[PDB]
From a paper:
Clostridioides difficile causes life-threatening gastrointestinal infections. Herein, we report 30 X-ray structures from a structure genomics pipeline spanning 13 years, representing 10.2% of the X-ray structures for this important pathogen. The Center for Structural Biology of Infectious Diseases (CSBID, formerly the Center for Structural Genomics of Infectious Diseases) implemented a structural biology pipeline starting in 2010 through paired efforts with systems biology, bioinformatics, and other research specialists in C. difficile pathogenesis. This project ultimately involved 335 proteins linked with pathogenesis, metabolism, and antimicrobial resistance.
The structures presented here are part of the C. difficile 630, R20291, and Y384 sets nominated at CSBID.
Author numbering: 292 to 461, 470 to 533, 543 to 561
The structure:
Amino acid sequence: VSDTPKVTDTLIELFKIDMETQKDNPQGNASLAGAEFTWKYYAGFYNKENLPAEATRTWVTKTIAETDSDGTTHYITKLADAYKVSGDSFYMQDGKAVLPLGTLTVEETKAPNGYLLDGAYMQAGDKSEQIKGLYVTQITEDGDLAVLSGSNQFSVSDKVIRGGVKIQKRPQGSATLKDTAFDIISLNDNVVLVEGKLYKKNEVVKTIHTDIEGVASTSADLLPYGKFRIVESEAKPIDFAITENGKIVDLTD
């Protein structure tokens, strides 16, 4: 027979994954670790449409890599000290973070390095509803207990940053009018999805040819955040990075 308000330690675990591959691994040299989530607890019972302007407590947590007993690394965040970035103190009971009756909201507020926030969504299981933006649930009474409504686990899908690259070969037009082919190679420790196909380190992900101006170019979404090597396909190679979304890296000097 306790003497403290009704609370539950059964909260929510978020698993960060790559949206395009649906894998527990980042693409290129991006990360699934470091994604930040803002959690807000409210003393009342609200829905998304009538949340008060001020939360009762606010916490910012981040995804951290964890390898399970099967040897699989996941990128997990939840309401505990090991995942905390900033915010108020947690409600603690018997060495664990708990929540009293009320409303709980959570949304991704910082994409992990190499990813975008744009379009990120949560999923409780396979085929279930894709939740975009702010997720809202409550801690409600069930007999003498406090219970969190809805799923206890979600996958959080993040869109990887993508970019492109353009280049030239090194009379008049005797160099630019030649048919110069360039191979683009992955220098990444993780797979890269390029034109519907997965490529590993040192594999050629694309070949591009020079136009009548002498410029070989890719689309602005060909390559995920990552390190790449561009070399004439016959030969002095160039290493470059994709970091800004939709930007064509300019190697034409």
